[PDB]
Amino acid sequence: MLSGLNHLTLAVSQLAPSVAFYQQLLGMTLHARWDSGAYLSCGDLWLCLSLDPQRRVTPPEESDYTHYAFSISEADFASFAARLEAAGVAVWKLNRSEGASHYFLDPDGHKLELHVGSLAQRLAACREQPYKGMVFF
C-alpha cells in the first residue's frame, strides 16, 4: 500500500532566494544544494526545491487552493506568524476556516500555511462545528 508522503517537490524560479526562505526564514534544515536544486528536511518531511525555468511567480488570486501546511506548536504559532508578518511575507488568506492557521506565500507564490493541530483534532472540532453536509466515516 501507499504509506505516506515520501517527498514534496516545489518548482522554484530562483534557487538561492528559495533556499534562503525555507532554511533561514522558516528554519528548515538544509542538507545539500546543487546548481539546479536543494534538499531540505522539516522534521520527517523531505522537501526538494527544483530550479524550473517554467516556474512563474504567481499571485494568489491566479492560483487555486492547493497548499502545503507545516506543523507548529500552540506555544510557537503566534510569534512565528508575527515574525513572518514583520518580515514582509505576503499572505493569501485571513479567515480561519480550518482551525488555528496562518496563510503565507513563498517567493514564487506557493501557498503555505502554519497550522496547529492534527487530523484527529480537526475531525473532533468539525463534529461540533461541521462543514456543510459533512459526514464522518
- Considering only 20, 45, 78, 125, the residue that binds a second copy (CB under 8 A) is 45
The residue assigned the cell 526538494 is 48
- Considering only 42, 45, 48, 90, the residue that binds ligand TJ1 (CB under 6 A) is 48
| Rounded Cα distance, 38 and 51, in Å | 9
| Rounded Cα distance, 102 and 31, in Å | 27
31-59 as b/e, with b when 16 or more CB fall inside 10 Å? eeeeeebbbbeeeeeebebebbeebeeee
Q: Is 23 in the site for ligand TJ1 (CB under 6 A)?
A: no
CB of 66 to a second copy, least distance (A): 5
Q: Is 134 in the site for a second copy (CB under 8 A)?
A: yes
Q: Provide the grid cell at 47.
A: 522537501
DSSP letter for 132, please: T
Task: Please give the residue ranges that form the binding site for a second copy (CB under 8 A).
Answer: 1-11, 26-28, 30-37, 39, 41-46, 48, 50, 52, 54-56, 63-73, 76, 80, 98, 110, 113-115, 117-119, 122-123, 126, 130-137
Site residues, ligand TJ1 (CB under 6 A): 7, 9, 37, 48, 50
